[PDB]
Amino acid sequence: VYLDRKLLTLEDKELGSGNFGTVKKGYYQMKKVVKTVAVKILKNEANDPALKDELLAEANVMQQLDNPYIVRMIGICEAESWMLVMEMAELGPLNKYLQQNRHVKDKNIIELVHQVSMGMKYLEESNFVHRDLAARNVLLVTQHYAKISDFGLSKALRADENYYKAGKWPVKWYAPECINYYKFSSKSDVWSFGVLMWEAFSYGQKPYRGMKGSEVTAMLEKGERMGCPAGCPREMYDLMNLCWTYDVENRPGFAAVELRLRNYYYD
Numbered sequence: 608v609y610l611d612r613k614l615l616t617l618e619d620k621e622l623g624s625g626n627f628g629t630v631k632k633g634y635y636q637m638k639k640v641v642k643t644v645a646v647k648i649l650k651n652e653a654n655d656p657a658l659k660d661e662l663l664a665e666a667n668v669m670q671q672l673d674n675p676y677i678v679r680m681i682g683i684c685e686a687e688s689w690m691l692v693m694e695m696a697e698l699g700p701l702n703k704y705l706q707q708n709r710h711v712k713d714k715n716i717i718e719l720v721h722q723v724s725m726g727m728k729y730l731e732e733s734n735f736v737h738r739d740l741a742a743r744n745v746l747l748v749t750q751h752y753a754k755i756s757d758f759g760l761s762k763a764l765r766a767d768e769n770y771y772k773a774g775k776w777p778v779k780w781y782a783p784e785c786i787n788y789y790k791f792s793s794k795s796d797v798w799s800f801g802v803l804m805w806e807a808f809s810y811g812q813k814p815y816r817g818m819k820g821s822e823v824t825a826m827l828e829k830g831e832r833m834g835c836p837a838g839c840p841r842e843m844y845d846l847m848n849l850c851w852t853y854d855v856e857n858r859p860g861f862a863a864v865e866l867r868l869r870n871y872y873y874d
Protein backbone atom coordinates (compact mmCIF):
# COMPACT_ATOMS: atom_id res chain seq x y z
CA VAL A 608 0.00 0.00 0.00
CA TYR A 609 1.46 3.34 -1.17
CA LEU A 610 1.26 6.73 0.61
CA ASP A 611 -1.68 9.09 0.07
CA ARG A 612 -0.55 12.31 -1.63
CA LYS A 613 -3.37 14.17 0.13
CA LEU A 614 -1.68 13.47 3.48
CA LEU A 615 1.71 14.83 2.26
CA THR A 616 2.51 18.53 2.54
CA LEU A 617 5.79 19.72 1.04
CA GLU A 618 7.82 22.84 1.59
CA ASP A 619 8.66 24.99 -1.43
CA LYS A 620 12.44 25.16 -0.87
CA GLU A 621 14.49 22.17 -1.95
CA LEU A 622 17.04 20.89 0.56
CA GLY A 623 19.22 19.38 -2.18
CA SER A 624 19.32 18.09 -5.76
CA GLY A 625 21.02 15.59 -8.09
CA ASN A 626 20.54 13.71 -11.36
CA PHE A 627 17.41 12.11 -9.95
CA GLY A 628 15.70 15.42 -9.13
CA THR A 629 15.22 17.09 -5.74
CA VAL A 630 14.96 16.48 -1.96
CA LYS A 631 12.35 18.55 -0.10
CA LYS A 632 11.20 18.74 3.48
CA GLY A 633 7.55 17.98 4.05
CA TYR A 634 5.08 16.58 6.60
CA TYR A 635 3.08 13.40 6.51
CA GLN A 636 -0.12 12.94 8.46
CA MET A 637 0.10 9.66 10.38
CA LYS A 638 -2.84 8.24 12.46
CA LYS A 639 -2.82 11.27 14.80
CA VAL A 640 0.61 12.87 14.91
CA VAL A 641 2.12 14.72 11.96
CA LYS A 642 5.59 13.56 10.99
CA THR A 643 8.38 15.66 9.49
CA VAL A 644 9.83 13.98 6.37
CA ALA A 645 12.62 14.23 3.81
CA VAL A 646 11.23 13.45 0.36
CA LYS A 647 13.21 12.38 -2.68
CA ILE A 648 11.21 13.51 -5.77
CA LEU A 649 12.05 12.40 -9.35
CA LYS A 650 12.75 14.89 -12.19
CA ASN A 651 10.53 15.46 -15.27
CA GLU A 652 7.51 13.80 -13.58
CA ALA A 653 9.41 10.45 -13.53
CA ASN A 654 9.90 10.23 -17.33
CA ASP A 655 13.04 8.02 -17.18
CA PRO A 656 12.38 4.28 -16.48
CA ALA A 657 15.97 3.99 -15.14
CA LEU A 658 15.43 6.56 -12.35
CA LYS A 659 11.98 5.03 -11.74
CA ASP A 660 13.36 1.51 -11.26
CA GLU A 661 16.23 2.75 -9.06
CA LEU A 662 13.81 4.58 -6.75
CA LEU A 663 11.72 1.39 -6.49
CA ALA A 664 14.82 -0.75 -5.82
CA GLU A 665 15.89 1.60 -2.96
CA ALA A 666 12.42 1.44 -1.35
CA ASN A 667 12.49 -2.37 -1.60
CA VAL A 668 15.68 -2.36 0.45
CA MET A 669 14.33 0.15 3.03
CA GLN A 670 11.14 -1.91 3.64
CA GLN A 671 13.30 -4.81 4.92
CA LEU A 672 15.40 -2.69 7.31
CA ASP A 673 14.43 -1.87 10.91
CA ASN A 674 17.17 -0.36 13.13
CA PRO A 675 17.61 2.73 15.28
CA TYR A 676 20.76 3.77 13.27
CA ILE A 677 19.25 3.44 9.77
CA VAL A 678 16.90 6.06 8.31
CA ARG A 679 13.29 4.71 8.26
CA MET A 680 11.13 4.82 5.17
CA ILE A 681 7.56 6.11 5.57
CA GLY A 682 6.61 5.02 2.05
CA ILE A 683 6.39 5.68 -1.67
CA CYS A 684 4.02 8.24 -3.15
CA GLU A 685 3.01 8.24 -6.85
CA ALA A 686 1.71 11.76 -7.39
CA GLU A 687 2.72 14.63 -9.72
CA SER A 688 6.05 12.74 -9.67
CA TRP A 689 7.37 9.60 -7.93
CA MET A 690 8.37 10.32 -4.33
CA LEU A 691 10.37 8.40 -1.74
CA VAL A 692 9.33 9.55 1.77
CA MET A 693 11.80 9.07 4.62
CA GLU A 694 11.94 10.18 8.25
CA MET A 695 13.66 13.59 8.38
CA ALA A 696 17.21 13.63 10.00
CA GLU A 697 17.10 17.38 10.75
CA LEU A 698 20.83 18.29 10.81
CA GLY A 699 21.70 16.61 7.47
CA PRO A 700 24.97 15.00 6.28
CA LEU A 701 27.71 14.34 8.80
CA ASN A 702 30.48 15.72 6.56
CA LYS A 703 28.77 19.10 5.94
CA TYR A 704 27.88 19.33 9.67
CA LEU A 705 31.44 18.76 10.88
CA GLN A 706 32.74 21.21 8.24
CA GLN A 707 30.48 23.81 9.93
CA ASN A 708 31.15 22.66 13.52
CA ARG A 709 34.85 22.03 14.12
CA HIS A 710 34.44 22.35 17.92
CA VAL A 711 32.79 18.95 18.14
CA LYS A 712 34.63 16.87 20.73
CA ASP A 713 36.54 13.71 19.87
CA LYS A 714 34.30 11.92 22.39
CA ASN A 715 31.18 13.13 20.40
CA ILE A 716 32.78 11.86 17.15
CA ILE A 717 33.44 8.42 18.69
CA GLU A 718 29.79 8.32 19.83
CA LEU A 719 28.55 8.98 16.30
CA VAL A 720 30.97 6.59 14.53
CA HIS A 721 30.00 3.93 17.10
CA GLN A 722 26.33 4.43 16.23
CA VAL A 723 27.20 4.00 12.57
CA SER A 724 29.05 0.74 13.48
CA MET A 725 25.95 -0.55 15.29
CA GLY A 726 23.79 0.10 12.27
CA MET A 727 26.36 -1.65 10.06
CA LYS A 728 26.58 -4.60 12.42
CA TYR A 729 22.82 -4.91 11.96
CA LEU A 730 23.11 -4.59 8.18
CA GLU A 731 25.85 -7.26 8.09
CA GLU A 732 23.66 -9.60 10.23
CA SER A 733 20.79 -8.90 7.80
CA ASN A 734 23.09 -9.74 4.82
CA PHE A 735 22.80 -6.43 3.04
CA VAL A 736 25.81 -4.61 1.54
CA HIS A 737 25.56 -0.80 1.61
CA ARG A 738 28.24 -0.09 -1.05
CA ASP A 739 28.30 3.70 -0.53
CA LEU A 740 29.24 4.07 3.10
CA ALA A 741 30.77 7.45 3.64
CA ALA A 742 30.40 10.49 5.73
CA ARG A 743 28.07 12.23 3.24
CA ASN A 744 25.58 9.33 3.67
CA VAL A 745 25.48 9.51 7.43
CA LEU A 746 22.70 11.87 8.63
CA LEU A 747 22.38 13.58 12.00
CA VAL A 748 19.13 13.50 13.91
CA THR A 749 20.81 15.43 16.78
CA GLN A 750 24.48 16.27 17.42
CA HIS A 751 24.38 12.97 19.35
CA TYR A 752 22.35 10.69 17.02
CA ALA A 753 23.54 9.53 13.61
CA LYS A 754 21.71 7.40 11.06
CA ILE A 755 22.90 5.67 7.87
CA SER A 756 21.20 6.72 4.66
CA ASP A 757 21.25 6.39 0.87
CA PHE A 758 20.77 2.76 0.05
CA GLY A 759 20.72 3.54 -3.71
CA LEU A 760 23.68 1.20 -4.44
CA SER A 761 22.83 -1.37 -1.76
CA LYS A 762 22.26 -5.06 -2.48
CA ALA A 763 20.51 -7.80 -0.52
CA LEU A 764 22.91 -10.75 -0.69
CA ARG A 765 21.66 -14.11 -1.92
CA ALA A 766 21.13 -16.79 0.63
CA ASP A 767 24.08 -18.82 -0.79
CA GLU A 768 26.73 -16.08 -1.20
CA ASN A 769 28.81 -13.75 0.95
CA TYR A 770 29.34 -11.15 -1.77
CA TYR A 771 27.78 -9.29 -4.62
CA LYS A 772 29.54 -9.13 -8.07
CA ALA A 773 28.99 -5.76 -9.79
CA GLY A 774 28.27 4.50 -13.44
CA LYS A 775 28.86 5.95 -9.97
CA TRP A 776 32.15 4.53 -8.62
CA PRO A 777 33.32 6.08 -5.27
CA VAL A 778 36.86 4.59 -5.55
CA LYS A 779 38.24 6.48 -2.52
CA TRP A 780 35.88 4.47 -0.22
CA TYR A 781 36.31 1.15 -2.02
CA ALA A 782 38.39 -1.80 -0.81
CA PRO A 783 41.02 -3.38 -3.15
CA GLU A 784 38.82 -6.46 -3.93
CA CYS A 785 35.99 -4.11 -5.17
CA ILE A 786 38.41 -2.43 -7.57
CA ASN A 787 40.38 -5.57 -8.58
CA TYR A 788 37.61 -8.23 -8.53
CA TYR A 789 34.33 -6.22 -8.41
CA LYS A 790 33.39 -8.15 -5.25
CA PHE A 791 31.27 -6.33 -2.64
CA SER A 792 30.80 -7.77 0.80
CA SER A 793 30.19 -6.55 4.35
CA LYS A 794 34.03 -6.69 4.71
CA SER A 795 34.17 -4.18 1.84
CA ASP A 796 31.73 -1.90 3.74
CA VAL A 797 34.22 -2.33 6.71
CA TRP A 798 36.94 -0.73 4.52
CA SER A 799 34.57 2.14 3.61
CA PHE A 800 33.80 2.54 7.32
CA GLY A 801 37.49 3.08 7.90
CA VAL A 802 37.45 5.92 5.38
CA LEU A 803 34.21 7.34 6.93
CA MET A 804 36.04 7.27 10.29
CA TRP A 805 38.93 9.25 8.87
CA GLU A 806 36.48 11.75 7.33
CA ALA A 807 34.72 12.23 10.68
CA PHE A 808 37.94 12.81 12.68
CA SER A 809 39.07 15.12 9.85
CA TYR A 810 35.90 17.17 10.40
CA GLY A 811 34.39 16.31 7.03
CA GLN A 812 37.46 16.92 4.86
CA LYS A 813 37.69 14.85 1.68
CA PRO A 814 39.86 11.67 1.75
CA TYR A 815 42.99 11.22 -0.43
CA ARG A 816 42.85 14.88 -1.36
CA GLY A 817 44.19 15.91 -4.75
CA MET A 818 44.49 12.31 -5.86
CA LYS A 819 42.83 10.61 -8.84
CA GLY A 820 41.28 7.18 -8.24
CA SER A 821 44.13 5.43 -10.06
CA GLU A 822 46.57 7.20 -7.75
CA VAL A 823 44.69 5.95 -4.66
CA THR A 824 44.72 2.32 -5.87
CA ALA A 825 48.47 2.60 -6.48
CA MET A 826 49.05 4.14 -3.04
CA LEU A 827 47.12 1.39 -1.25
CA GLU A 828 48.88 -1.40 -3.20
CA LYS A 829 52.18 0.07 -1.92
CA GLY A 830 50.92 -0.46 1.68
CA GLU A 831 50.51 3.28 2.23
CA ARG A 832 47.55 4.64 4.10
CA MET A 833 46.18 8.08 4.97
CA GLY A 834 47.74 9.50 8.13
CA CYS A 835 46.21 10.12 11.55
CA PRO A 836 43.97 13.21 11.52
CA ALA A 837 44.88 16.15 13.80
CA GLY A 838 43.64 15.35 17.34
CA CYS A 839 42.35 11.86 16.53
CA PRO A 840 43.04 9.38 19.31
CA ARG A 841 45.62 6.77 18.34
CA GLU A 842 43.22 3.98 19.30
CA MET A 843 40.82 5.26 16.60
CA TYR A 844 43.53 5.60 13.94
CA ASP A 845 44.62 2.02 14.73
CA LEU A 846 41.02 0.90 14.13
CA MET A 847 41.06 2.77 10.80
CA ASN A 848 44.18 0.82 9.73
CA LEU A 849 42.49 -2.43 10.81
CA CYS A 850 39.49 -1.55 8.57
CA TRP A 851 42.03 -0.94 5.71
CA THR A 852 43.40 -4.50 5.99
CA TYR A 853 44.30 -5.28 2.36
CA ASP A 854 43.38 -8.98 2.50
CA VAL A 855 39.63 -9.27 2.90
CA GLU A 856 39.97 -12.63 4.64
CA ASN A 857 41.91 -11.07 7.50
CA ARG A 858 39.93 -7.81 7.63
CA PRO A 859 37.49 -7.54 10.60
CA GLY A 860 33.70 -7.72 10.17
CA PHE A 861 31.35 -5.21 11.82
CA ALA A 862 30.88 -7.34 14.99
CA ALA A 863 34.57 -6.87 15.85
CA VAL A 864 34.61 -3.20 14.70
CA GLU A 865 31.51 -2.25 16.74
CA LEU A 866 32.90 -4.10 19.77
CA ARG A 867 36.18 -2.11 19.62
CA LEU A 868 34.34 1.21 19.30
CA ARG A 869 31.99 0.17 22.15
CA ASN A 870 34.85 -0.69 24.50
CA TYR A 871 36.82 2.47 23.68
CA TYR A 872 33.72 4.69 24.11
CA TYR A 873 32.62 3.25 27.47
CA ASP A 874 36.02 2.20 28.97
Ligand SMILES: CCN(c1nc(Nc2ccc3c(c2)S(=O)(=O)NC3)ncc1Cl)c1cccc2[nH]ncc12
Pocket residue numbers: 622623624630645646647678691692693694695696697698699700746756757758759
Ligand atom coordinates in the same frame (compact mmCIF):
# COMPACT_ATOMS: atom_id res chain seq x y z
C1 LIG B 1 20.15 13.07 2.13
C2 LIG B 1 18.73 13.15 1.63
N1 LIG B 1 17.82 12.22 2.37
C3 LIG B 1 17.51 12.51 3.67
N2 LIG B 1 17.73 13.77 4.05
C4 LIG B 1 17.43 14.08 5.32
N3 LIG B 1 17.65 15.32 5.78
C5 LIG B 1 18.45 16.37 5.29
C6 LIG B 1 18.65 17.48 6.10
C7 LIG B 1 19.38 18.56 5.64
C8 LIG B 1 19.91 18.57 4.35
C9 LIG B 1 19.68 17.47 3.55
C10 LIG B 1 18.95 16.39 4.01
S1 LIG B 1 20.46 17.71 2.01
O1 LIG B 1 21.73 17.05 2.01
O2 LIG B 1 19.58 17.41 0.93
N4 LIG B 1 20.58 19.33 2.29
C11 LIG B 1 20.74 19.64 3.71
N5 LIG B 1 16.92 13.25 6.25
C12 LIG B 1 16.70 11.99 5.87
C13 LIG B 1 16.99 11.59 4.58
CL1 LIG B 1 16.77 9.91 4.19
C14 LIG B 1 17.03 11.29 1.63
C15 LIG B 1 15.64 11.41 1.60
C16 LIG B 1 14.87 10.51 0.89
C17 LIG B 1 15.45 9.47 0.17
C18 LIG B 1 16.83 9.34 0.21
N6 LIG B 1 17.67 8.45 -0.38
N7 LIG B 1 18.97 8.70 -0.09
C19 LIG B 1 18.97 9.76 0.69
C20 LIG B 1 17.66 10.23 0.93
